Design a protein around this nucleic acid. Structure first.
Lengths: 694, 135, 59, 37, 106, 55, 144, 147, 356, 158
RNA sequence: UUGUAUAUAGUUAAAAAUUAAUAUUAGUACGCAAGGAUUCAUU
RNA sequence: AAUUAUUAUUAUAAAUAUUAUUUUAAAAAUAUAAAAAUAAAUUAUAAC
């Protein structure tokens, strides 16, 4: 039926079409019809009715549309085409980018000007407008137009009076609202519970382009989280209240606020101790901000066995005692978790744990704890199709049987060419498991001899296996030349497991399965080389957090110095910001760092990111894309066909005349892909057919 | 002067103004042998104390780099021990502590950590979330 | 046009009279001329000292 | 012909265009008595 | 990129975020005035108002009248304009043609 | 001509659209559901069926 | 103003607009009649295919028509098709007329006095209950 | 703009109150800070710059009649397009256009050669004609300096 | 342009001794006739009379206010000083209405009572509607009002533009251009605009894409007999002597060779309306435009002309926000020969002969 | 230097209108501003009773039409009789009050008009005619106080 | 034609000709299926 | 005539053979060629 809206009250004067659809029936339409032309006539149809809908529906539809977004990068990046009128290219935002810029333009009128009472009432709404306004990166509209991070467009930022970029000129979508939301956090929050004081503190950090949150905004909640504490007296021991500290300490780490007191308590009070009984030394633990933060300890209660948030957080604190202080709380957390026999706490505590060890200066103490806690075992149990290999990689002795791992001064694995000695044993082939899974798993340190005999070794990155797997697949073939190789890391595996389930679209998560099917079933066949956690600790420089974006590089900066004969390639997408580790990812400028940083034996392997040489010696071949075959554009709008929808054609047919051959009724210009029928339009004098699938 | 085309080689900036005399011990002169031209008297100049060796050199005893990064952080933080806090303030005293302890400069970057850990910061429709332990 | 740009027939700045001969920059682009005192074609219009006011007699 | 009264340009908008032809020992090195825009 | 053309591919996004900061720095100051003493100086009328200008009828140095036109716009009227309906036009306003030939003061 | 053209300058011709819109373009096509060969939309066969109805 | 903003002498375009005005310098022939012979680009005309002259344009058009009256199909090239489908109907608007002059209007055009009879024999009994657009124009997927 | 040779990682935010200070001189000190010459780690390849916030521009000074007899001349492409504009004529248009022009005279002095070095240091100065400026959260430290 | 300057008056001369009415100093709480006396008496500079009470400022002002409360009629022209005009209500010097989108329908010729003969162009204003208002970040006077035309099926526009009309709910229009209105001239989105919006005598500006001519030479584009100098500042010899001169070495910008010849946006800015047909939504203008039939022409008003506002005191005043009809005014009741509104004579005298 | 212009004086006494598809003369028959103001020696016919040839009178000025305003032209005209009587001379320079012209001049009321022959009458320095009687039908444009208060306003106008 | 002078100003309007705005969307036919109608009836 | 090219190589004889090579769906300059006026065939025309 063609029902759903009603014309304005006073008809012959205003003909505007109201709205009367239920929020459900907008979401059902939003979901069953994910095409862009239906996903526009849903956002717009909803933003017109944004002043009637209840504070709860405002929570839902906002929280709902985020399913279409993704924290990772470009927010509203629904582009139409990259026009090539001139030499370089520019990007044209589709009708769906202009629909949220329209939606957010209706939120900044309802919540700022005509109903300023709407957002104080329901505290969980603001804690959803904020997080929505972060996913849509409205503090940086340039990326709604930017395709390649390396190629930053200024379409939404820079206009010239000659008449370029006028209509998409200077965009200020929520900068009115986003700054009214902070006028509401300073001076009310009585009806805010600590779970929301944290989230609101997490909104203003995320939405900012770098996570700084305009400290008076933040400081207005910290000033309110103490009043929520003073009524308990800073002796909180609700176990879930001992979590809201591990989150309050991860934030104020992204922000970078350095408050020892929250660590003086979350850790257990070890600092503010080891500051007693001094003969003669410093008092580092205090870093007192007493007038700002309240004295806090937890209790004689748990005071131990923290959660994952805490360990990835203490990584950033460069203090020597805090790590040894937090290296037992990782043992206890790996004791309590193992004895509790839980999987999720057993993997979460490891992938958030390596971030802690990756900061200690003593790489030996870092490597000792990595094998006593079976890190190479528990991590890989999680990853979807890795459970098979984790078994074999956890063979009873050679899980990590204290390989030579001869680290020299500076921490660099100067074992190369003196672990190539191997102690002369040839790192044996086939072992056991009569089913002929007998070929042993290829840990790097055990198989560094092979990489020397290799002709051209490959490195994998989680991007090259996203958007398609047709590029890895080729290298899967070339593995059986004997001359080639392939190195995946336990980091690249984990960073594939995220996008394996936490993917924006199923067309992408389906890949990271087929992208992990191969690598987990090319590792079990003894072709690829898994650099495990025990070796990502070996190669990385001590003190630096080296995620999968730098394990791809510190490996290519290790082996481009410690085995220079062989090639190195990088399976990744040309859109990765890690295609140029000099431009991005470079360190703080320093006078001592040279351009010879790569080959000098005394420098850390990431000192070479301040050079265009590391990118020079590491090649980046696009091995093989899918075919360049054009997609079926017969069903899209065509400026050439458009002139034929209504073109009189009587003298064209003779016997089989139809009513109007070209005109697909209900569609836009006979374009079976640009569907519009049953979406809310207004044409009180022209017919329209109701919705049917195709 | 040296290829008269034009001189774009970085020139030296003139000398800062000396501190007030306040002593009348001839703190004025320049062609006077009782002192050199340079007049450096800073906040923490009296900590650089010198002892006359026997050869002819001096053994200046100065505070360590891990101490003036402590003195500074003290000064920088008790700007207001209960007063306003600046985004630029926190990010500075977040580094002065990182400089206080083992000041080799990180070799990689200062924001690669945040950039990768903004999924537990940001709430993004938990069906597409990032929980440390993926359920 | 406010920005201006209504330059004269050439002269930019003319200095003081100093008797019959008054200077002038005659900025334009070059010169050629002569000179009553020593007659040699003298490109150097950047400075031409006219006589009483006759542009016919120069430097 | 007889190239007289050189002009050494220093930059622009900071040389006043009368000081260009200065550094020549003459009635210049004074202030232009009647400037034109 | 002309000088006066690079000064504006830089400052125009700054001039935006500047004046929109002042407008914010007014609501804080007007709201602070609201909590502060109501009837006081507080730098003009604090509540989003533009002190009406009384002095706009002058007699310039040549002894002839000179008027200064100044108009303000209340954000409520221009907001009632954009949602309510105007009034019916008087039959004598459209049936009387806008006569040509602007009559003098004869 | 006034000189010879270095190679980086004979490639300059290939940047603009007037070159790509003349050589490097691929046409959308489809199999005629009867004529069985590829086709562009608009131009038809000679067969009395491929010509009475217009696939 | 009172004179049109463009005078009589100015060529508009191909695919231009109508741009109506008063003018007094048109209608060379009995225009719009089954043999108009006008040839140009502005819509009220037939598309002027490439011929060596206006006369030689008619000769082409004549022998293109008297091959559509023997074999009721034809495979023409370029702008001969639109200016033949247009002319194929004119012959048939001229067939139904059947007056003593039509056959003398059509004997002048065709190079063949036989086909005129076949034209006047079939087309009344054949196109009686078809208003207009008697000829089909199918564009072939091939090219010379 | 990340683009190695940028170095936004050791930034310090200065503040040069231009009140009463000579405009051909505030343009000098601010250039040693935007071009990052006040840094002992200055190498010309790296553009290690420190943001300057030159508030209170409209209170600048110009010795003598140099408000009336100093031209901002620019000659466009159109013949007869030579424009001459005093400082008191560009100060009508925008007071920051006279300071941004006197900065352009100083950054150019050492960086005219390459476009990436001509313009990038210019984007570090924030010319504000009065007190108000949105950088309260950047803690602009008032740089000490005596002309 | 001479005789286009208003009365010159500086700012350093708008002081107490020049205001037409009592010059009113501001004192926070209220206006006053005396300067603000600084609170800190150490600020008071020498020979600066901190006047607490001046009679002349208080006498001349006292008679002034009493005379206005007692003799309103004589002191009428001094009632906008203390009672300023409100907002809206169509200030004549400030308000700018919006226009509408018309279509060139046909041409004909009309005659006034005098024997004159006009060349009329019937413009059809089909289905105009305010489809949305917009402001550049809420800045002042940057307001705009977009007005659609010619309701059309949804199968006509491209999706990315039809989706825009599916935002504001208005019927999907054929095209919509925007006019910069003053915030008092607004109207809610969707107000069905009538053609009677215009009055039969006002000078209306139009803008359109004139007829395309293709690619013409110079004899047709700028066809002239001789010219091309604009020599200007470049030097040259008159009166020989100190002579070294410069000549052209480039085709200076703005030459006059061949080109497109006319697909641009023409603008007639003084056309007076002739015959408003408000049944058929037609407007006749006594001018021929060089545009193809069927074009869209955005109509405005010539805000001022020859020195006098269009909607001034003497001549008519427009239906300000827009023209809203009655409740029983059914145009379909009356024939097109009744919904006509002709114009006054545009000429004072029969133009075949001369002025009497 | 810069031969800025030759003759330069025809442009002070001619009505020159560029041909640029907008500025253009036209044949008349379009609207006011008909075209072709008849600028050369055109040998107008005389009509008033004198020994002016009544068949030839050679033109002097480079402009003649009312959409060019014959109402203030001071149009000189030279007499060139092929025969007069075997009273004026065949060699004098009289002004002329143009009457009509074969060129189809459109009026400001659409009333096109063209006569069998372009004719005129000789007059004097004080704008008084030289004849007693006139043998033709003058044009409306002869109604100005310029050429009325001495012109007999001969007879039936058009 | 009034001021001023023995003759007559000085102002303003009517008439002698065409008005103009740059860059955010999918493309290798005729931008007309052409005989100016976005199929005037079906074949 | 450089040729399968501007070409009836014509000393002679001749008079109703349809006697067998000429692409292209746009716009300007130009090039050929073209209704109307200051008794003849002419103009110029840089006009359809």
């Amino acid at each position: 039926d063609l029902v759903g809206y009603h014309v304005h009250r006073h008809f012959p004067l205003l003909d505007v079409l109201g709205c009367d659809r239920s929020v459900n029936d907008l979401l059902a339409q939003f979901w069953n019809r994910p095409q862009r032309e239906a996903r526009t006539a849903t956002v717009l149809d909803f933003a017109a009715t944004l002043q009637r809908h209840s504070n709860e529906e405002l929570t839902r539809v906002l929280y709902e549309l985020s399913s279409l977004f993704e924290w990772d990068g470009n927010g509203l990046q629904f582009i139409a085409a990259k026009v090539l009128k001139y030499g370089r290219s520019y990007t044209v935002s589709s009708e769906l980018t202009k629909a949220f810029v329209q939606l957010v333009d209706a939120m900044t009128v309802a919540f700022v000007e005509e109903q300023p009472h709407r957002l104080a009432e329901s505290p969980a709404l603001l804690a959803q407008v904020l997080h929505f306004l972060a996913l849509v990166k409205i503090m940086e509209p340039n990326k709604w137009y930017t395709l390649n991070p390396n190629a930053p467009q200024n379409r939404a930022d820079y206009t010239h009076p000659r008449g370029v970029n006028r209509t998409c000129g200077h965009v200020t979508t929520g900068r009115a609202l986003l700054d009214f939301l902070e006028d509401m956090v300073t001076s009310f929050t009585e009806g805010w519970s600590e779970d929301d004081i944290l989230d609101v503190m997490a909104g203003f950090s995320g939405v900012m382009p770098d996570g700084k949150a305009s400290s008076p905004v933040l400081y207005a909640l910290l000033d309110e989280l103490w009043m929520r504490w003073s009524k308990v007296g800073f002796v909180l021991s609700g176990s879930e209240q001992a979590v809201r500290l591990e989150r309050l300490y991860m934030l104020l780490q992204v922000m970078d606020m350095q408050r020892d007191a929250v660590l003086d308590a979350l850790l257990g009070g070890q600092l503010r101790a080891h500051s007693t009984a001094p003969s003669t030394s410093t008092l580092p633990t205090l870093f007192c901000e007493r007038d700002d933060t309240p004295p806090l300890t937890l209790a004689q209660s748990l005071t131990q066995t923290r959660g994952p948030d805490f360990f990835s957080a203490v990584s950033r604190d460069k203090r020597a005692m805090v790590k040894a202080a937090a290296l037992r709380l990782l043992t206890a957390s790996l004791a309590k978790a193992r004895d509790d026999s839980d999987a999720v706490l057993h993997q979460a505590l490891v992938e958030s744990g390596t971030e802690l060890l990756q900061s200690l200066t003593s790489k030996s103490a870092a490597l000792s704890f990595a094998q006593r806690e079976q890190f190479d075992v528990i991590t890989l149990r999680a990853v979807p199709h890795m459970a098979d290999v984790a078994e074999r990689l956890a063979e009873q002795r050679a899980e990590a049987p204290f390989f030579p791992l001869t680290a020299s001064a500076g921490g660099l694995p100067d074992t190369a060419a003196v672990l190539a000695h191997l102690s002369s044993h040839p790192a044996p082939y086939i072992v056991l498991c009569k089913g002929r899974r007998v070929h042993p798993v290829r840990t790097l340190v055990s198989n560094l001899d092979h990489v020397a005999a290799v002709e051209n070794v490959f490195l994998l990155h989680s991007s090259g296996v996203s958007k398609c797997v047709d590029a890895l697949v080729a290298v899967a073939r070339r593995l059986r030349s004997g001359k080639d190789a392939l190195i995946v890391t336990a980091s690249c595996l984990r960073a594939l497991q995220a996008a394996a389930q936490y993917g924006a679209t199923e067309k992408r998560r389906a890949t990271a399965d087929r992208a992990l099917d191969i690598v987990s079933y090319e590792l079990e066949a003894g072709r690829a080389i898994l650099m495990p956690v025990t070796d990502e600790l070996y190669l990385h420089d001590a003190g630096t957090y080296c995620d999968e974006d730098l394990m791809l590089w510190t490996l290519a900066a290790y082996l481009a110095r410690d085995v220079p004969l062989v090639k190195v390639h990088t399976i990744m997408s040309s859109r990765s910001r890690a295609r140029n580790p000099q431009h991005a990812l470079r360190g703080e400028h320093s006078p001592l760092t040279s351009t010879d940083d790569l080959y000098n034996k005394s420098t850390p392997l990431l000192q070479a990111l301040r050079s265009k040489e590391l990118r020079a010696v590491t090649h980046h071949p696009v091995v093989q894309r899918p075919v360049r075959d054009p997609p079926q554009t017969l069903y899209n709008v065509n400026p050439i066909r458009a002139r034929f929808v209504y073109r009189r054609d009587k003298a064209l047919f003779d016997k089989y005349h139809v009513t109007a051959r070209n005109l697909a009724p209900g569609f836009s210009q006979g374009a079976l892909n640009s569907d519009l029928r049953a979406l809310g339009f207004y044409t009180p004098d022209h017919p329209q057919v109701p919705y049917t699938p195709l | 002067v040296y290829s008269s085309k034009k001189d774009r080689t970085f020139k030296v900036m003139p000398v800062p103004p000396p501190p007030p005399a306040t002593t009348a011990v001839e703190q004025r002169d320049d062609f006077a042998d009782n002192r050199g031209l340079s007049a450096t008297t800073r906040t923490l100049s009296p900590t650089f104390r010198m002892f006359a060796l026997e050869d002819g050199g001096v053994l200046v005893s100065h505070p360590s780099h891990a101490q003036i990064m402590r003195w500074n952080q003290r000064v920088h933080t008790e700007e207001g021990k209960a007063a306003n806090s600046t985004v630029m303030d926190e990010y500075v005293n977040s580094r002065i502590q990182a400089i206080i302890a083992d000041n080799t400069i990180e070799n990689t970057s200062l924001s690669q950590w945040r950039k990768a850990h903004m999924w537990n910061v940001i709430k993004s429709h938990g069906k597409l979330q990032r929980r440390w332990g993926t359920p | 046009a406010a920005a201006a740009a209504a330059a004269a027939a050439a002269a930019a700045a003319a200095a003081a009279a100093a008797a019959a001969a008054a200077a002038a920059a005659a900025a334009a682009a070059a010169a050629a001329a002569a000179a009553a005192a020593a007659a040699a074609a003298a490109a150097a219009a950047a400075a031409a000292a006219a006589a009483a006011a006759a542009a016919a007699a120069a430097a | 012909a007889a190239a007289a009264a050189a002009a050494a340009a220093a930059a622009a908008a900071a040389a006043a265009a009368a000081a260009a032809a200065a550094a020549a020992a003459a009635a210049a090195a004074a202030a232009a008595a009647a400037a034109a825009a | 990129d002309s000088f006066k053309e690079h000064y504006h591919r830089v400052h125009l996004p700054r001039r935006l975020a500047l004046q929109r900061y002042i407008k914010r720095e007014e609501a804080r100051l007007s709201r602070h005035k609201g909590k502060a003493v109501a009837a006081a100086a507080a730098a003009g009328v604090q509540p989003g108002e533009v002190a009406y200008k009384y002095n706009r009828w002058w007699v310039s140095n040549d002894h002839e009248f000179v008027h200064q036109f100044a108009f303000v716009e209340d954000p409520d009227v221009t907001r009632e304009k954009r949602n309510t309906l105007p009034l019916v036009t008087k039959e004598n306003i459209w049936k009387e043609p806008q006569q040509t030939f602007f009559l003098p003061f004869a | 001509p006034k000189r010879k053209k270095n190679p980086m300058q004979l490639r300059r011709k290939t940047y603009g659209l007037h070159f790509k819109e003349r050589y490097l373009k691929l046409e959308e096509w489809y199999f005629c559901p009867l004529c069985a060969e590829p086709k562009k939309q608009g131009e038809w066969c000679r067969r009395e069926d491929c010509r009475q109805i217009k696939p | 103003g009172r004179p049109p903003p463009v005078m009589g002498h100015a060529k508009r375009m191909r695919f231009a607009g109508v741009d109506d005005n008063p003018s007094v310098t048109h209608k060379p022939w009995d225009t719009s009649e089954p043999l108009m012979a006008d040839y140009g680009w502005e819509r009220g005309k037939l598309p002027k295919f490439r011929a060596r002259s206006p006369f030689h344009r008619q000769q082409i058009a004549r022998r293109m028509v008297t091959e559509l009256i023997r074999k009721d199909y034809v495979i023409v090239g370029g702008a001969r098709a639109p200016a033949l489908r247009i002319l194929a109907d004119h012959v048939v608007e001229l067939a139904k007329a059947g007056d003593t002059d039509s056959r003398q209007q059509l004997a002048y055009f065709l190079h063949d006095p036989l086909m005129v009879d076949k034209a006047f024999d079939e087309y009344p009994r054949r196109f009686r209950d078809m208003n207009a657009k008697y000829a089909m124009m199918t564009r072939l997927k091939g090219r010379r | 703009m990340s683009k190695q040779w940028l170095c936004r990682e050791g930034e310090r935010w200065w503040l040069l109150d231009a009140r009463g200070q000579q405009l051909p001189h505030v343009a000098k000190i601010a250039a040693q800070y935007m071009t990052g010459q006040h840094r002992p780690d200055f190498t010309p390849g790296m553009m290690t710059g420190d943001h300057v916030v030159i508030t209170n521009i409209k209170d600048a000074v110009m010795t003598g009649d140099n408000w009336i007899r100093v031209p901002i001349t620019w000659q466009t492409a159109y013949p007869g397009g030579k424009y001459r504009v005093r400082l008191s004529e560009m100060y009508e248009r925008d007071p920051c256009m006279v300071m941004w022009w006197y900065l352009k005279d100083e950054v150019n002095r050492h960086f005219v050669r390459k476009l990436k070095t001509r313009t990038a240091p210019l984007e570090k100065a924030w010319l504000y004609e009065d007190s108000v400026h949105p950088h309260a959260e950047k803690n602009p430290r008032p740089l000490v300096w005596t002309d | 342009w001479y005789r286009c300057y208003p009365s010159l008056m500086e700012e350093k001369d708008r002081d107490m001794y020049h205001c037409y009415y009592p010059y009113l100093f501001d004192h926070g709480d209220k206006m006053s006739l005396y300067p603000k006396i600084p609170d800190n008496p150490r600020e008071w500079q020498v020979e600066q009379l901190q006047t607490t009470y001046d009679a002349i400022r208080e006498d001349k002002y006292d008679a002034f206010v009493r005379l206005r409360a007692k003799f309103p009629e004589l002191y009428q022209d001094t009632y906008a000083w203390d009672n300023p005009p409100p907002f809206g209500e169509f200030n004549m010097f400030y308000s700018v209405r919006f226009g509408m989108i018309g279509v060139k329908a046909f041409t004909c010729k009309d005659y006034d009572d005098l024997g004159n003969q006009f060349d009329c162009t019937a413009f059809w204003f089909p289905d105009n509607q305010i489809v949305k208002h917009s402001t550049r970040n809420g800045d002042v006077g940057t307001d705009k009002v977009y007005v659609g035309a010619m309701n059309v099926p949804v199968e006509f526009h491209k999706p990315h533009v039809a989706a825009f009309y599916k935002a504001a709910g208005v019927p999907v229009k054929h095209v919509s251009a925007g006019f910069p209105v003053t915030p008092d001239a607004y109207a809610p989105v969707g107000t069905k605009l009538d053609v009677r919006h215009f009055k039969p005598g006002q000078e209306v500006t139009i803008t359109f894409q004139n007829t395309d001519y293709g690619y013409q030479g110079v004899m047709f584009r700028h066809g002239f007999d001789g010219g091309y100098v604009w020599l200007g500042d470049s030097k040259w010899q008159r009166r020989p002597g100190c002579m070294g001169a410069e000549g052209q070495k480039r085709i200076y910008p703005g030459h006059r060779m061949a080109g497109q010849t006319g697909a641009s946006a023409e603008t007639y800015d003084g056309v007076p309306v002739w015959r408003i047909d408000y049944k058929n939504s037609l407007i006749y203008l006594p001018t021929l435009i060089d545009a193809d039939v069927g074009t869209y022409v955005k109509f405005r008003d010539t805000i001022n002309t020859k020195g006098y506002t269009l909607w001034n005191e003497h001549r008519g005043t427009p239906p300000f926000p827009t023209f809203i009809p009655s409740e029983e005014e059914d145009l379909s009741k009356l024939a097109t020969d009744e919904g006509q509104l002709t114009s006054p004579p545009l000429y004072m005298y029969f133009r075949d002969e001369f002025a009497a | 230097g810069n031969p800025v212009n030759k003759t330069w004086f025809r442009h002070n006494l001619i009505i020159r209108r560029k041909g640029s598809y907008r500025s253009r003369w036209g044949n008349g028959t379009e609207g006011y501003g008909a075209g072709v103001p008849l600028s050369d020696q055109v040998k107008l016919h005389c009509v008033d009773n004198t020994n002016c040839k009544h068949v030839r009178l050679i033109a002097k000025a480079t402009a003649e039409r009312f959409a060019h305003c014959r109402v203030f032209p001071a149009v000189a005209h030279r007499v060139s009789v092929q025969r007069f009587k075997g009273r004026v001379k065949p060699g004098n320079i009289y002004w002329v009050c143009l009457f009509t012209r074969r060129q189809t001049n459109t009026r400001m009321s659409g009333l096109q008009t063209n006569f069998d022959r372009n004719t005129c009458i000789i007059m004097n320095d004080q704008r008084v005619p030289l004849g007693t009687r006139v043998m033709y039908c003058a044009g409306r444009h002869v109604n100005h106080k310029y050429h009325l208060k001495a012109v007999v306003l001969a007879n039936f106008f058009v």
